[PDB]
Each structure stands twice: as C-alpha cells, then as structure tokens.
Design an enzyme around this catalytic site. Sequence first.
Site, PDB file in Angstrom:
ATOM      1  N   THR A 154       0.702  -1.562  -0.032  1.00 17.35           N
ATOM      2  CA  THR A 154       0.346   0.188  -0.298  1.00 17.35           C
ATOM      3  C   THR A 154       0.859   1.327   0.212  1.00 17.35           C
ATOM      4  O   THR A 154       0.822   2.319  -0.855  1.00 17.35           O
ATOM      5  CB  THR A 154      -1.176  -0.080   1.118  1.00 17.35           C
ATOM      6  OG1 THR A 154      -1.606  -1.525   1.322  1.00 17.35           O
ATOM      7  CG2 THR A 154      -2.005   1.255   0.909  1.00 17.35           C
ATOM      8  N   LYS A 186      -7.906  -0.877  -6.035  1.00 13.12           N
ATOM      9  CA  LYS A 186      -7.827  -2.597  -4.830  1.00 13.12           C
ATOM     10  C   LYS A 186      -9.322  -2.868  -4.822  1.00 13.12           C
ATOM     11  O   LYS A 186     -10.350  -3.128  -4.045  1.00 13.12           O
ATOM     12  CB  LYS A 186      -7.540  -1.562  -3.139  1.00 13.12           C
ATOM     13  CG  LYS A 186      -7.629  -2.762  -2.586  1.00 13.12           C
ATOM     14  CD  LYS A 186      -6.215  -2.831  -2.622  1.00 13.12           C
ATOM     15  CE  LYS A 186      -5.761  -3.920  -1.291  1.00 13.12           C
ATOM     16  NZ  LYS A 186      -4.418  -4.183  -0.522  1.00 13.12           N
ATOM     17  N   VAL A 194     -10.354  -6.218  -4.130  1.00 15.39           N
ATOM     18  CA  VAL A 194     -10.455  -6.682  -2.512  1.00 15.39           C
ATOM     19  C   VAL A 194      -9.533  -6.675  -1.670  1.00 15.39           C
ATOM     20  O   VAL A 194      -8.506  -6.347  -2.024  1.00 15.39           O
ATOM     21  CB  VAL A 194     -10.465  -8.511  -2.994  1.00 15.39           C
ATOM     22  CG1 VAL A 194     -10.999  -8.931  -1.842  1.00 15.39           C
ATOM     23  CG2 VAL A 194     -11.112  -8.889  -4.382  1.00 15.39           C
ATOM     24  N   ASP A 248      -7.237   0.253   2.115  1.00 14.60           N
ATOM     25  CA  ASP A 248      -5.801   1.126   1.852  1.00 14.60           C
ATOM     26  C   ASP A 248      -6.254   1.949   0.664  1.00 14.60           C
ATOM     27  O   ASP A 248      -5.757   2.336   0.753  1.00 14.60           O
ATOM     28  CB  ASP A 248      -5.224  -0.655   0.757  1.00 14.60           C
ATOM     29  CG  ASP A 248      -5.063  -1.599   1.670  1.00 14.60           C
ATOM     30  OD1 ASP A 248      -4.263  -1.438   3.376  1.00 14.60           O
ATOM     31  OD2 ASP A 248      -4.163  -2.099   1.013  1.00 14.60           O
ATOM     32  N   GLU A 268      -3.632  -3.059  -7.261  1.00 15.20           N
ATOM     33  CA  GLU A 268      -3.317  -3.490  -5.797  1.00 15.20           C
ATOM     34  C   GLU A 268      -3.346  -4.673  -5.420  1.00 15.20           C
ATOM     35  O   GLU A 268      -5.219  -5.627  -5.227  1.00 15.20           O
ATOM     36  CB  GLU A 268      -3.533  -2.924  -4.387  1.00 15.20           C
ATOM     37  CG  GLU A 268      -2.431  -3.149  -4.048  1.00 15.20           C
ATOM     38  CD  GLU A 268      -2.488  -2.174  -2.471  1.00 15.20           C
ATOM     39  OE1 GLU A 268      -1.478  -2.151  -0.894  1.00 15.20           O
ATOM     40  OE2 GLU A 268      -2.685  -0.695  -2.516  1.00 15.20           O
ATOM     41  N   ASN A 305      15.385 -15.078  -1.935  1.00 15.19           N
ATOM     42  CA  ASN A 305      14.354 -16.346  -2.306  1.00 15.19           C
ATOM     43  C   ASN A 305      13.246 -16.129  -2.532  1.00 15.19           C
ATOM     44  O   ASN A 305      12.619 -16.525  -3.559  1.00 15.19           O
ATOM     45  CB  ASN A 305      14.774 -17.113  -0.829  1.00 15.19           C
ATOM     46  CG  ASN A 305      14.157 -19.204  -1.136  1.00 15.19           C
ATOM     47  OD1 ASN A 305      13.631 -19.393  -2.448  1.00 15.19           O
ATOM     48  ND2 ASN A 305      12.694 -19.116  -0.906  1.00 15.19           N
ATOM     49  N   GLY A 327       9.808  -1.625   0.350  1.00 11.49           N
ATOM     50  CA  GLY A 327       9.377  -1.296   0.777  1.00 11.49           C
ATOM     51  C   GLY A 327       9.582  -0.399   2.222  1.00 11.49           C
ATOM     52  O   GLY A 327       8.585   0.729   3.114  1.00 11.49           O
ATOM     53  N   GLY A 351       8.686   4.150   8.754  1.00 12.50           N
ATOM     54  CA  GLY A 351       7.813   4.854   8.560  1.00 12.50           C
ATOM     55  C   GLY A 351       7.080   5.496   8.213  1.00 12.50           C
ATOM     56  O   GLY A 351       6.446   6.537   8.269  1.00 12.50           O
TER      57      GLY A 351
HETATM   58  O1  LIG Z   1      -2.564  -7.390   1.574  1.00  9.43           O
HETATM   59  C1  LIG Z   1      -2.046  -7.987   2.628  1.00  9.43           C
HETATM   60  O2  LIG Z   1      -0.741  -7.803   2.272  1.00  9.43           O
HETATM   61  C2  LIG Z   1      -2.633  -6.478   3.700  1.00  9.43           C
HETATM   62  C3  LIG Z   1      -4.336  -7.320   3.954  1.00  9.43           C
HETATM   63  C4  LIG Z   1      -4.352  -6.644   5.684  1.00  9.43           C
HETATM   64  C5  LIG Z   1      -4.486  -7.692   6.314  1.00  9.43           C
HETATM   65  C6  LIG Z   1      -4.279  -9.430   6.015  1.00  9.43           C
HETATM   66  C7  LIG Z   1      -3.844  -8.989   4.691  1.00  9.43           C
HETATM   67  C8  LIG Z   1      -4.445  -9.734   3.269  1.00  9.43           C
HETATM   68  O3  LIG Z   1      -4.709  -9.409   2.788  1.00  9.43           O
HETATM   69  C9  LIG Z   1      -3.193 -11.202   3.746  1.00  9.43           C
HETATM   70  C10 LIG Z   1      -3.068 -12.014   3.920  1.00  9.43           C
HETATM   71  C11 LIG Z   1      -2.553 -13.696   4.302  1.00  9.43           C
HETATM   72  C12 LIG Z   1      -2.402 -13.599   2.978  1.00  9.43           C
HETATM   73  C13 LIG Z   1      -3.021 -13.064   1.704  1.00  9.43           C
HETATM   74  C14 LIG Z   1      -4.183 -12.001   2.231  1.00  9.43           C
HETATM   75  O4  LIG Z   1      -4.382 -10.918   0.958  1.00  9.43           O
END
Ligand SMILES: O=C(O)C[C@@H]1CCC[C@H]1C(=O)c1ccccc1O
Lengths: 227, 226
Positions: free
Chosen positions: B17, B38, B40, B50, B109, B148, B170, B200
């Site tokens: 994000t 985004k 989903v 996000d 995203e 990896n 990131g 941060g």
């Molecule tokens: O997108 C993110 O990584 C942050 C989100 C925020 C909450 C759970 C995360 C999530 O979506 C996610 C986690 C594990 C596997 C697949 C996923 O899509």
Amino acid sequence: GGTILVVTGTGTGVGKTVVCAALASAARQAGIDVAVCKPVQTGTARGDDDLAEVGRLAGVTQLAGLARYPQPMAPAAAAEHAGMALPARDQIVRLIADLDRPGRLTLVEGAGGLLVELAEPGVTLRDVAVDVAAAALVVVTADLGTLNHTKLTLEALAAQQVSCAGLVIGSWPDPPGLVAASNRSALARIAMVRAALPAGAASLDAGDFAAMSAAAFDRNWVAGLVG
Amino acid sequence: GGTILVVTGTGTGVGKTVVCAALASAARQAGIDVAVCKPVQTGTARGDDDLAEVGRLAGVTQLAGLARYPQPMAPAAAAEHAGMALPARDQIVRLIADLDRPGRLTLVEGAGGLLVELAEPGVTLRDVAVDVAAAALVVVTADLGTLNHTKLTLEALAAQQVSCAGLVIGSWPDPPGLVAASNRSALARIAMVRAALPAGAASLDAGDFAAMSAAAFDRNWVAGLV
Ligand SMILES: O=C(O)C[C@@H]1CCC[C@H]1C(=O)c1ccccc1O
Ligand SMILES: O=C(O)C[C@@H]1CCC[C@H]1C(=O)c1ccccc1O
C-alpha cells in the site's frame, strides 16, 4: 541407490532442521537406515549447527556436512564476508551420492528457501535435486502469507520437474486459531500434508521427541519412502 | 489506453500500500493522472482500507474497489468465513479496463502475495495482470529471506510472460544493517531497484510524504511510465 529427499522450506525459520530430525526419527523407528546431510551451513559464529541439532534430537549418527560459514546470512553473503568461496556443484552432488545406498533414506537439508544460492554459480537446492534425482519435502509455516509462499515454492519445483514429497508444517499451535486452522485446510488442497509438528518440538528430550516424531507422520507414508 | 501496473508483493505486510501511494504521489507530481484499484480489501473489521491510505497520502481521487471483508485473512478465507463468494474475474478485468485511459497510470493492488486467490474461480493477481496486459511491480522487504521470496515471485511472473517492471523495498531500516545492506546490493543484481522507502513513511502527513515520494523514485523512470 536409495531414497534422497531434499528438505527445503517456504523460507528461513520455518523449521527445516526440526523436520529433518523428526522424519529421521520416525524413519529409524520404521527400521529404515537414515543419513542426514547439510551441504551448506551458515551462522556458525552464532552457534548454528543443524547436523548437531539433528544428532541431538534424533540420535542420527550418520551426519555429513561440507561448507561452514560464521555469519548468519545467505551462504553467498556469509562466504564473501569470510573471504571464502561457495562449494562447487559437484562437491555437493558427490557428498550426497557418497551417502546414497540401497535401503537408506538420505535427507538433504537446504539453507533458507528453495532458490538460495548454495554453490557457484547460482546453483540451488533445486538444481541439486534434479542432479541426484531427489524429490523435495517442503516445510511450511501455519501463519499468514504461507499459501503464497508455498504456492511459489511448489510452482518452482514443478518448473524443473522436481516431485513434491509433501508439506510439513514445522510449528503448529495448540489450540489453533481461525487463521491457522483455515491455512491447514487450504494447504491440503495444494499438496499432501505429511505432518504438523507441535511448537517447541526442539525442546523435547530424546524419548519425547521420538514419541512425538513417531506420532507426527503416517507410518505408511514413512515406511513407503524406501524400498 | 494508457498504462496499467499491478503492484504486488513477495508476502503480506511488505509495504504494498505505501509503495502504491508513494508511486502515485510521484506520478502526480510528474503531472500524470493516477487511478488506484484495490479489487478486494480484507481486514476491514479492524480498520484496514488501503484505498483510503492512498488517498490520504497521495491525494489520488480515482479509488476503485469491489469487495470488502471483515476478517483480516486472505480473500478466499474471508469469503468462506463471511459466507460470500469473491468477485468474478470478469468484474475485476472490466473495472481495471474502465479505469484505463490514455495519459493515465492505473495501479492495481493485489492482496497478500502474487498468487493469493482474488476472484472466482481461483484467479490471482497474476492472471489479472495477463488479462489486462499489465506489467508487475514487486514490493520486497530487505530482511533475511527476501532474495529467495523475490526470485520465486519473479519466476512466477516470467512463467506467464508477465513482465516485471521492477522492485521497490517497502521499508528501509534505520540504521540499515549488515543484512539489509547485503540484501539491497544483491536485490539490484536480480532486478532493477526503483525505490527504497524509509521505514515509518506511512505515518507521514501528506506534505512530507509527497516530498519523500519525489525523492524516492527516479524522475526519468516515473515520467517514462506514461
Ligand atoms: O494485503 C495484505 O497483505 C495486507 C492484509 C491486511 C490484513 C490481511 C492482509 C491480507 O490481505 C492477506 C494476508 C495473508 C494472505 C493473503 C492476504 O491477502
Ligand atoms: O537454514 C536456515 O534457514 C536457518 C539459517 C540460520 C541463519 C540463516 C539461516 C539460513 O540458512 C538462510 C537464511 C536466509 C537466506 C539464506 C539462508 O541460507
């Protein structure tokens, strides 16, 4: 020859060592002759010694190392920071082949994940597996992100026609939560789950560890690993 | 059409994000029109959103999504536990294609990593990226394990002729550290390192954030995206 399994994982810290020691114990209890092999070992300056941990926990005496590097980083890095060179492909392959015997299960423990450089140039545990015609046991976590990291790892194995012996969850909480329990279910739709080791298995003494190791795996799948 | 980038990651919680907001802000300051999709969103029950954070930090107003799940799980788990199928592949591909227009950078995203299930039946961000002819930008940590996870993600991208537009770290620690420094050097050998965002940076107000974002990217590369 016998049966050669490389033990890799979706990452670092997933429990490769404890799974080797666990399979090795259950295999021995099946009356199988077991050797364990750690081609490349880093972090020795921190006390990291996977073969010794496997000897400790599982009573395997047939242990075989090769490269040792002080820093706890990727082998490539750990070598440069010591003025040392990585092993050669055929140095690793020869080490595996010299342990390989009929009726022996030989376990080949990677360093980090599957695509880590173990040998010059760019030689991975996946390339070692092709050469010695070994299948791969993939150690995974129960945690968030494990489906992606596993899907990636399995895909990478299949691109090089390296068979997947199974998945082992290398640390499993009890009682499990909602995200962990949903992961375990999904992981069985991707590949066979050969076991899920209780967290802190590396704290069990000789007997308890063996009693757990005998419990964790299917006796039929273990026994069937070696002619 | 214009230019569609999917922004994915090697894992969950690697800074997808904030890299979206960061490149949107940079491209806006290049005078590019930016949309962010985004499809989903999960974790809503605890406050995840996000698209909001991209609006807050980069001021993007074209902010498009299709479904939102309470549980902070992977999409399909959230859908099973809430009792409600994911969106269909069709809706995702058409939304991104309706957002795309000449002169626009449209970021897409994913959720989690490249191969988490986004849509029915079992279609991932990688599939979406093929269907819309989009390159892929990969967000990576600098922690032990990143090379990896990064090689695996790249190999998955190449396996479907999805071009990799490059890497962004990131979160860049302070002070960096022997392993992060080591990992950043070897990350640049397997792919182009477009940016490294300071740790941060997602707490920044919008003014600082856009300044960081102007510094974080190569202005010649950003401008060349559209
Ligand atoms: O997108 C993110 O990584 C942050 C989100 C925020 C909450 C759970 C995360 C999530 O979506 C996610 C986690 C594990 C596997 C697949 C996923 O899509
Ligand atoms: O075997 C393990 O994963 C535990 C070791 C112990 C210290 C660093 C780990 C390691 O080997 C490693 C980690 C990241 C990348 C490549 C690597 O080779």
